[PDB]
Amino acid sequence: SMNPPPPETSNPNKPKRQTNQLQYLLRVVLKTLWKHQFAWPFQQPVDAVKLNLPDYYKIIKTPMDMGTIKKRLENNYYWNAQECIQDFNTMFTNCYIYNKPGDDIVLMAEALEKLFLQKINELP
Numbered sequence: 001s002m003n004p005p006p007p008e009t010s011n012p013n014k015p016k017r018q019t020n021q022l023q024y025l026l027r028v029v030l031k032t033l034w035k036h037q038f039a040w041p042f043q044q045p046v047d048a049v050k051l052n053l054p055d056y057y058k059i060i061k062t063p064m065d066m067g068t069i070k071k072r073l074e075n076n077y078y079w080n081a082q083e084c085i086q087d088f089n090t091m092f093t094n095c096y097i098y099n100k101p102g103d104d105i106v107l108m109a110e111a112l113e114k115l116f117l118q119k120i121n122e123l124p
């Protein structure tokens with residue numbers, strides 16, 4: 001496999017919690033971004049094989065996508081909201097590191113991030 005293993009969504013050794021903030025991140029934040037017209041390039045790990053990007057996983061050390069975040073939320077992987085927020089932030093920063101500033105994917109990421117930042121502003 002020329003893709004790395006995806007980021008883990010279950011680990012018996014990692015303690016976990018359900019908090020109001022994590023339920024909000026699932027039911028409101030992820031739910032909103034997931035249903036956005038531009039969600040789909042972010043709904044699964046970057047497939048470097050399918051997309052013919054042999055340098056992607058030479059450059060991006062900490063890959064992250066909303067498919068992974070959705071499973072981490074549903075599977076109770078997280079201890080706190082900040083871990084989940086960091087995963088979103090990483091997904092956006094990775095996009096801005098790898099792609100050119102004028103690229104369509106960066107415009108898609110920017111639209112999702114604006115919605116994200118507004119929902120995080122409203123964290124309970």
Ligand SMILES: COC[C@@H](C)n1c(C2CCOCC2)nc2cnc3cc(-c4c(C)noc4C)c(OC)cc3c21
Binds near residue numbers: 042047095099105
């Ligand atoms: C708009 O389509 C772009 C096209 C290349 N693409 C398709 C088509 C589907 C139909 O078959 C042809 C390929 N699927 C995907 C799925 N994920 C993608 C993720 C990124 C991406 C992110 C996010 N961060 O870095 C990168 C890099 C991406 O960036 C150019 C393109 C993706 C992508």
